[PDB]
Design a protein around this ligand. Structure first.
Ligand SMILES: [Mg+2]
Ligand SMILES: [Mg+2]
Ligand SMILES: [Mg+2]
Ligand SMILES: [Mg+2]
Ligand code: NA
Ligand code: NA
Ligand code: NA
Ligand SMILES: [Zn+2]
Ligand SMILES: [Zn+2]
Ligand SMILES: [Zn+2]
Ligand SMILES: [Zn+2]
Lengths: 125, 127, 124, 128
């Protein structure tokens, strides 16, 4: 299991590493939001060393193969255990890309987004 | 429970046959190559002009949705591309951009086959 | 007449004209990124009215001749010292065709398809 | 440092001798028609199987790259085709699709000369 699910604290970068770490901590027990945050981190162009660490740590040959597996888990999360109720009219591809983009824009511009109001919409408890 | 078979039979039905013709002719043309044939499938799925053919493939390949199917094809493409088989042909570029370029070049070819010669582009990948 | 660097939106109701305009205003400092947005706008088929206005406004006999000039300026901009430093052996024809495709993703679906972080890579 | 002043003296760089022979025979026949001369030059440059002859042409014509050479040929192609003296033979078709089909018809002939009569295709642009 190349994913098999954490904490890096490894030569990390500026504010952005702290903002990501705090987001991961609050939604650590949420598995859909965790992958969404990870996917935004991997897609984040301003986290190259953290991404390369995760690609190596998870035994993946490259970033694109890691990003592909995360998107895959994301779609299988949205395959109606619960959030088909929350999916509704929207397709899973735009919702994923909507959530990831909102996180990256929050990491880049934290003063401009209430990412908690966006993320806890997908909390089941 | 094999989701991706390499030998199979594509549907024969009402698929807006003019563009369905272009796809089937290129798949048959490059059925020799494993990577190139995989690229043609990707362009077909991403193409919004073929909602009948993909939904058949989505159902035929036991995938719950079109997204989960294109994700598997993209995964297989990166494996043959990023992991070295055609990596000697892959140069300074990233395996993502070359696929999204071949996918785009095919879709634009299917949409206007007289404005783009797709054959010589796909011939660039030997074997 | 020939191209050189007055364009205020369009006549009809399309909101995608607004997305193009704000990307243009933000990246006005960079010469290369503006042409990329222009070539992508012209290549965009959801913007036929704005494109036809630019064809006549820049006095070009056709759309193909207009897109041909922008591609020419793009390839030469990538030949300039600073941009050719960002080059890094990547093929000019493809990086332009990729950048074109990727902003049209943000044009059709701005809710996703992170765009600023993408072309912030081409800043300095 | 001029750009695309038509003139002969082309080298036919090195290997791919048969394809170079097919290209020269076409270039030699239609050398008095400017439009077809650039259509053949377009297909030659675009041809993935003439990399040595193209790189010479790029360097010889003092162009920074192959893509910048192909762009200049396309410009003169559309310039000559649409406006001055080919709107007549062009008629109602679109110039871009006409260039690429002629481009593709030449390349398809060069790769397999037995399956195409490129003379009949290219002769529709003589006798203005
Ligand atoms: Mg990243
Ligand atoms: Mg489709
Ligand atoms: Mg347009
Ligand atoms: Mg060539
Ligand atoms: Na924080
Ligand atoms: Na937080
Ligand atoms: Na601030
Ligand atoms: Zn980092
Ligand atoms: Zn269909
Ligand atoms: Zn418009
Ligand atoms: Zn050669």
């Amino acid at each position: 299991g190349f994913l098999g699910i954490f904490f890096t604290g490894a030569d990390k970068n500026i504010e952005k590493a702290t903002l990501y770490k705090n987001l991961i901590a609050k939604y650590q027990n949420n598995h859909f939001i965790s992958l969404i945050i990870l996917s935004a981190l991997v897609s984040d162009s301003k986290t190259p060393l953290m991404t390369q660490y995760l690609v190596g740590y998870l035994d993946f040959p490259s970033k694109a193969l890691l990003a592909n597996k995360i998107t895959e888990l994301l779609l299988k999360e949205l395959e109606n255990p619960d959030m088909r109720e929350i999916l509704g009219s929207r397709l899973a591809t735009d919702v994923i890309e909507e959530l990831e983009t909102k996180i990256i824009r929050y990491i880049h511009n934290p003063a401009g987004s209430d990412i908690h109001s966006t993320l806890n919409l997908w909390t089941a408890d």
